[PDB]
CSV table of N, CA and C in Angstrom, one decimal:
chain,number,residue,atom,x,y,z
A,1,UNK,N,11.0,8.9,-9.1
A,1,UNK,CA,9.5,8.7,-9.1
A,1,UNK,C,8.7,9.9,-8.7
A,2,UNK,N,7.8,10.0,-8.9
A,2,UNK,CA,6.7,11.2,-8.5
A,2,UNK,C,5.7,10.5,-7.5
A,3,UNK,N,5.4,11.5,-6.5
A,3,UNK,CA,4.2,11.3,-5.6
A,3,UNK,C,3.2,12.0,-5.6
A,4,UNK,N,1.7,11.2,-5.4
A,4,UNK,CA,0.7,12.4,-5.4
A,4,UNK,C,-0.3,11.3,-3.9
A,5,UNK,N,-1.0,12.7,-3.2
A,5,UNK,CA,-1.8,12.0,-2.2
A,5,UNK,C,-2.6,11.6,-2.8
A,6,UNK,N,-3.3,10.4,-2.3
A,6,UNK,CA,-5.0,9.8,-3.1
A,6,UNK,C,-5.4,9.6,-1.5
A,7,UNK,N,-7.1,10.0,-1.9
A,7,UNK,CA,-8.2,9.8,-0.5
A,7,UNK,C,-8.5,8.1,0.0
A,8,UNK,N,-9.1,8.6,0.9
A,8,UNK,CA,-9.5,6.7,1.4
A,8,UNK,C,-10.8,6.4,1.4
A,9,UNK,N,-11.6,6.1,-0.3
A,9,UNK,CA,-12.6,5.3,-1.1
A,9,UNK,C,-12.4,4.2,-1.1
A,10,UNK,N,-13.0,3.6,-2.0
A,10,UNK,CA,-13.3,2.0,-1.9
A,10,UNK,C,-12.2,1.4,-2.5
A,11,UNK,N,-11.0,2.0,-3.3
A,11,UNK,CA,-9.9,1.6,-3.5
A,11,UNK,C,-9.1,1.3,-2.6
A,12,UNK,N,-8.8,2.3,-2.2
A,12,UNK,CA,-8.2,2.4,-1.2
A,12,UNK,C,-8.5,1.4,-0.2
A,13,UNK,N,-9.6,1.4,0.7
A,13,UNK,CA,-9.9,0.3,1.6
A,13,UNK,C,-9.3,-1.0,0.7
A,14,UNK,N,-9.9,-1.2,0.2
A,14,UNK,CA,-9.8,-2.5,-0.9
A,14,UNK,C,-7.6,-3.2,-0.5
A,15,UNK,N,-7.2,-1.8,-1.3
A,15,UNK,CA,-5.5,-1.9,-0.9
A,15,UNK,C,-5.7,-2.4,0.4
A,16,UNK,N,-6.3,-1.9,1.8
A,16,UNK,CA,-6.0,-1.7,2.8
A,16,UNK,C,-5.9,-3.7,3.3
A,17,UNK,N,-7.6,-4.1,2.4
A,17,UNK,CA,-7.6,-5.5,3.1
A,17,UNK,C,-6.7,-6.1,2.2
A,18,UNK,N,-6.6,-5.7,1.2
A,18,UNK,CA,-5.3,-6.6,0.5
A,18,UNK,C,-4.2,-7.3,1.8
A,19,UNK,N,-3.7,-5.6,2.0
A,19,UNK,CA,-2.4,-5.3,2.6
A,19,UNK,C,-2.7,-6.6,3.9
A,20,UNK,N,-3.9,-6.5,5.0
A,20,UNK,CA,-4.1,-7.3,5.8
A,20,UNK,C,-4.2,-8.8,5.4
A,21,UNK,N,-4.6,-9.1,4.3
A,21,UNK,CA,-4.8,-10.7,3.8
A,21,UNK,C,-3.8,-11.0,3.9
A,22,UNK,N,-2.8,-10.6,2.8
A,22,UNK,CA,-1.7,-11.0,2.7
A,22,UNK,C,-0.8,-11.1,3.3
A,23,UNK,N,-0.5,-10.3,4.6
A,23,UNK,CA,-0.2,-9.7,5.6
A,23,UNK,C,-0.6,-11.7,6.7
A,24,UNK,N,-1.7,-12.0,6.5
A,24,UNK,CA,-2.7,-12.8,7.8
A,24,UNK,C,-1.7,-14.5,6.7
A,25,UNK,N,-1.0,-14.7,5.1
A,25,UNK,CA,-0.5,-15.7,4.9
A,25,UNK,C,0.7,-15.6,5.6
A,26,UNK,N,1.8,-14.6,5.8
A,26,UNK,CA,3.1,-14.6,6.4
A,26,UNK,C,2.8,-15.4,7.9
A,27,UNK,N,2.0,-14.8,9.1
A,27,UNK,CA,1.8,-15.6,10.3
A,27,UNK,C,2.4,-15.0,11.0
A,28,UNK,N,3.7,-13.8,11.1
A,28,UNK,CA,4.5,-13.4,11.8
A,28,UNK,C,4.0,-12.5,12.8
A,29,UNK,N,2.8,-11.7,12.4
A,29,UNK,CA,2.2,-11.2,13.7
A,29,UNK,C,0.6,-12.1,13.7
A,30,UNK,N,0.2,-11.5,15.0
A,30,UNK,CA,-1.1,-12.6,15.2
A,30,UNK,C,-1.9,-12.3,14.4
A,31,UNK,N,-2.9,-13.0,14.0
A,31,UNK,CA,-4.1,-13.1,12.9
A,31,UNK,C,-5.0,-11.5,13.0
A,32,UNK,N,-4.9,-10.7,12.0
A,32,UNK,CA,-5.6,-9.6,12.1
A,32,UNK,C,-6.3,-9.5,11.2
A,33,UNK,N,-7.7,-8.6,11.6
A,33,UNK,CA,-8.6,-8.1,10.8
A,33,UNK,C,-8.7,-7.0,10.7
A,34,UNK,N,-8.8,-6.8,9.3
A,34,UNK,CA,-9.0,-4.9,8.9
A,34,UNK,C,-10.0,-4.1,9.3
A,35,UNK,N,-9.4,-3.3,10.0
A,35,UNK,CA,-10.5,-2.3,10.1
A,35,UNK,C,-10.8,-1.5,9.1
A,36,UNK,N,-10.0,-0.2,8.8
A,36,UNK,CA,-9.9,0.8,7.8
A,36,UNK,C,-8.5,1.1,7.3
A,37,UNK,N,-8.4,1.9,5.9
A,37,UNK,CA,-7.2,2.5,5.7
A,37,UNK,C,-7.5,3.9,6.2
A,38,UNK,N,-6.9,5.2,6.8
A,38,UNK,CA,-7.1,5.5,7.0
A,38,UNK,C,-6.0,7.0,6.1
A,39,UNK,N,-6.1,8.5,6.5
A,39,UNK,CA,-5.4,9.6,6.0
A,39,UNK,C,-4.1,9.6,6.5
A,40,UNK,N,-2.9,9.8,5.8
A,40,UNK,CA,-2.9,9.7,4.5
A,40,UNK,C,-2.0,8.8,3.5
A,41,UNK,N,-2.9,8.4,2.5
A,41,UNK,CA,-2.4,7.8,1.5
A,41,UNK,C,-1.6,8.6,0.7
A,42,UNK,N,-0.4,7.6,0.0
A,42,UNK,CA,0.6,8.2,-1.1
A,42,UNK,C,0.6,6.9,-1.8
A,43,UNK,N,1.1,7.7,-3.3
A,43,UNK,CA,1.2,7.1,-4.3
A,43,UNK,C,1.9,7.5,-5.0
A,44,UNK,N,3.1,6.7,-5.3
A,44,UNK,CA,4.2,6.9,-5.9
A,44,UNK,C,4.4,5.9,-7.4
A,45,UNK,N,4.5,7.2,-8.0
A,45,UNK,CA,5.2,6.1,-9.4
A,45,UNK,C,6.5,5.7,-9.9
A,46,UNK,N,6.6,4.6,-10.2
A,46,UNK,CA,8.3,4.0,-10.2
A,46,UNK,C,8.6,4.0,-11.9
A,47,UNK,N,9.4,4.6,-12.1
A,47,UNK,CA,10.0,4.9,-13.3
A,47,UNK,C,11.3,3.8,-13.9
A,48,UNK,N,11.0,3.0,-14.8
A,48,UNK,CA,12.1,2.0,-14.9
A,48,UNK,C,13.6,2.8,-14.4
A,49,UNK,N,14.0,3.8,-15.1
A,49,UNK,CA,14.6,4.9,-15.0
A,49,UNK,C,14.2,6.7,-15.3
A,50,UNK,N,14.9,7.5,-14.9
A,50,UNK,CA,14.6,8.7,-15.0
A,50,UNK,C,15.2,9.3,-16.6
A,51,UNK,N,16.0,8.4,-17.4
A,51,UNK,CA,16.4,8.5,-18.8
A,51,UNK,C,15.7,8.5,-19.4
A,52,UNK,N,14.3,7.8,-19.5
A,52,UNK,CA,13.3,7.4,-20.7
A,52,UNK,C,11.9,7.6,-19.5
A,53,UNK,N,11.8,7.6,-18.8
A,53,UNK,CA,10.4,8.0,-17.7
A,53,UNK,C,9.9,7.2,-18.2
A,54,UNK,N,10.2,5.5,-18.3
A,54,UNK,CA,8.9,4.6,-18.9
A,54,UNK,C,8.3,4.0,-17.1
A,55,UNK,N,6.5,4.0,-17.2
A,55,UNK,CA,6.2,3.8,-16.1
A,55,UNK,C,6.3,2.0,-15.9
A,56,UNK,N,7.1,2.0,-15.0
A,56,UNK,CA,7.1,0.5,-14.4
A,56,UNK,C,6.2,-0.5,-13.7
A,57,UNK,N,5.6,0.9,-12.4
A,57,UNK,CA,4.3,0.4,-11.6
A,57,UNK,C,4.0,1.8,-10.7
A,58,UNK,N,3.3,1.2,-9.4
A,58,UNK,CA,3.2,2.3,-8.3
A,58,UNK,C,3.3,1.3,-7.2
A,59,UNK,N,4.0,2.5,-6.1
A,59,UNK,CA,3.7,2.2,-4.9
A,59,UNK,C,2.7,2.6,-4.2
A,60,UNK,N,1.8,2.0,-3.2
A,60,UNK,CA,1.1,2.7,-2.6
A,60,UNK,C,1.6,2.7,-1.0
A,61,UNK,N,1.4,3.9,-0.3
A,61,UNK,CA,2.2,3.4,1.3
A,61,UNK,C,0.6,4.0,2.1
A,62,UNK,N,0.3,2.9,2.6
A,62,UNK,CA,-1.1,3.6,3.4
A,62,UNK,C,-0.7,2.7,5.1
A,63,UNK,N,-1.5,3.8,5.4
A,63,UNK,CA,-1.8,3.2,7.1
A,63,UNK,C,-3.3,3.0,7.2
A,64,UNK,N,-3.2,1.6,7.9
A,64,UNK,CA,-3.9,0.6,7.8
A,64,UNK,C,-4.2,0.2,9.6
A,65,UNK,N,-5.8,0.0,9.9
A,65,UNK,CA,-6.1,-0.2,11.3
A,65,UNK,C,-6.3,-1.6,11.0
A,66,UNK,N,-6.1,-2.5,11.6
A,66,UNK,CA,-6.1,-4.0,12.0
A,66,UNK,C,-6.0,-4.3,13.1
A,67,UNK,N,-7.8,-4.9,13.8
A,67,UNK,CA,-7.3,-5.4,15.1
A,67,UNK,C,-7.2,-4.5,16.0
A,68,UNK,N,-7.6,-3.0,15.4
A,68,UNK,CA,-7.3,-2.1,16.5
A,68,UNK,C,-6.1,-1.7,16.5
A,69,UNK,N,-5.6,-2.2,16.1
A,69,UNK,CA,-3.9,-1.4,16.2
A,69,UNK,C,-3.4,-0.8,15.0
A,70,UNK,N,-2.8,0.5,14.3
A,70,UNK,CA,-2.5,0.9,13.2
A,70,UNK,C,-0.7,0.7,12.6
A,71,UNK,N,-0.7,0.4,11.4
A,71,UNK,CA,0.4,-0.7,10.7
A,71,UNK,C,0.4,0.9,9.2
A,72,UNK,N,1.9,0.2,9.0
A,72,UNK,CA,1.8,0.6,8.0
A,72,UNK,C,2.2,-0.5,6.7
A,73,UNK,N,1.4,-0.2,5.6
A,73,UNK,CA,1.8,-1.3,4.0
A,73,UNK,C,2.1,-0.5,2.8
A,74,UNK,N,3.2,-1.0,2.8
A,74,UNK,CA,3.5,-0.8,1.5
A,74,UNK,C,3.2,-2.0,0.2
A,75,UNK,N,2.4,-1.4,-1.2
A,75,UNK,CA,1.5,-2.5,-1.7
A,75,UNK,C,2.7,-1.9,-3.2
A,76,UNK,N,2.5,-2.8,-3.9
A,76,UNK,CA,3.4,-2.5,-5.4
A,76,UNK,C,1.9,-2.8,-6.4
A,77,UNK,N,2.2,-2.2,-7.3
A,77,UNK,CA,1.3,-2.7,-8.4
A,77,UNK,C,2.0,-2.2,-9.6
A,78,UNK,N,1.9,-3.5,-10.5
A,78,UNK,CA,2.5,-3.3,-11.8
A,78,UNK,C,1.8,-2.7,-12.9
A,79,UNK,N,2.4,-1.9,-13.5
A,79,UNK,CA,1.2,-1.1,-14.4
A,79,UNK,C,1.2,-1.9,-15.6
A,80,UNK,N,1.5,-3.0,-16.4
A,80,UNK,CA,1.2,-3.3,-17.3
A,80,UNK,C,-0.4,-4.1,-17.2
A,81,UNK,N,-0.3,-5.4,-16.2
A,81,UNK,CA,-1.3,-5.8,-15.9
A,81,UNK,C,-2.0,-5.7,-14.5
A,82,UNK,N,-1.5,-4.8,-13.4
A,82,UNK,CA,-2.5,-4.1,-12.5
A,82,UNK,C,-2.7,-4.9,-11.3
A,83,UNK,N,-1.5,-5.7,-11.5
A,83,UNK,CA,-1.6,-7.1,-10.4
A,83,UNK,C,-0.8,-6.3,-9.0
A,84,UNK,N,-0.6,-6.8,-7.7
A,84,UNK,CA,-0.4,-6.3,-6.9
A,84,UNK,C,0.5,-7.3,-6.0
A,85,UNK,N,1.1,-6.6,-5.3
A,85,UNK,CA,2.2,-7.9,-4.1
A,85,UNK,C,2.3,-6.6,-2.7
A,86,UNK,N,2.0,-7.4,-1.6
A,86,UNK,CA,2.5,-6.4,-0.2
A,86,UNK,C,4.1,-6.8,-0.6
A,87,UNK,N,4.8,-5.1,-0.5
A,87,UNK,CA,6.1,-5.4,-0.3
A,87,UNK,C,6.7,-5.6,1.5
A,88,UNK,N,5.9,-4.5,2.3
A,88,UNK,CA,6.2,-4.6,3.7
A,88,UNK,C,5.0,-4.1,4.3
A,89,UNK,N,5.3,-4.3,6.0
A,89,UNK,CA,3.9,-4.4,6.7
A,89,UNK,C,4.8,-4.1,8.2
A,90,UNK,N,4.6,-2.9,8.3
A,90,UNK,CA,5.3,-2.8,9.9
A,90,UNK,C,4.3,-2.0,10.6
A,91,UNK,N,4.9,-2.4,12.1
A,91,UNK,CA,4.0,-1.5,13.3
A,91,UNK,C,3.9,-2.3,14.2
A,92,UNK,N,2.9,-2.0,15.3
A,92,UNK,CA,2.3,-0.7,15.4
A,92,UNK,C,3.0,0.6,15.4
A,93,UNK,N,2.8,1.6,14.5
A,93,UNK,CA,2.4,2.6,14.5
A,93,UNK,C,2.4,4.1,14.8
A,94,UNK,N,2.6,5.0,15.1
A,94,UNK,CA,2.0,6.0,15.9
A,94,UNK,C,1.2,6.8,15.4
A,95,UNK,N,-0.4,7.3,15.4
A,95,UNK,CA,-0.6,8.0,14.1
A,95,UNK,C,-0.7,9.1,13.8
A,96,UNK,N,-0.6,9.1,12.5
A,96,UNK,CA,0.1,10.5,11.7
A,96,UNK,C,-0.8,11.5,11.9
C-alpha cells in the first residue's frame, strides 16, 4: 500500500466523530465525546494485491481527542462505494 499525510479539515474531523460514535456503540470504554482530530493524519491505500495495484479501499489512522483524553482510530473505507467501518480504537495515547 502507499501512504500520504492529509491535514485536519472538515473531513477529517468528520472521520474523527465517526471514529468516536462508533467507538460510544462498542461500550468498552466510558461514553466519550469528540473533541478534535488532531496532526498527524495518514492515509493509506490498500491494494487488493501488489500484482495488478487494483485499489481496494483506504485506511485512515488519526489521533483523535475525546473527553480530553487522546485515542488513536483506525477508520477503513471502501473505495467502490465510500462507506466506512472503525477497524480499531486504542489509548490513551501519548501525543505525537
Amino acid at each position: 500500500g502507499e501512504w500520504e499525510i492529509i491535514d485536519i479539515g472538515p473531513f477529517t474531523q468528520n472521520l474523527g466523530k465517526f471514529a468516536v460514535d462508533e467507538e460510544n456503540k462498542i461500550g468498552q470504554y466510558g461514553r466519550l465525546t469528540f473533541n478534535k482530530a488532531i496532526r498527524p493524519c495518514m492515509k493509506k491505500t490498500i491494494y487488493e494485491n501488489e500484482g495488478f495495484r487494483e485499489i481496494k479501499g483506504y485506511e485512515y489512522q488519526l489521533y483523535v481527542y475525546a473527553s480530553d483524553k487522546l485515542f488513536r482510530a483506525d477508520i477503513s473505507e471502501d473505495y467502490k462505494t465510500r462507506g466506512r467501518k472503525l477497524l480499531r480504537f486504542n489509548g490513551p495515547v501519548p501525543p505525537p
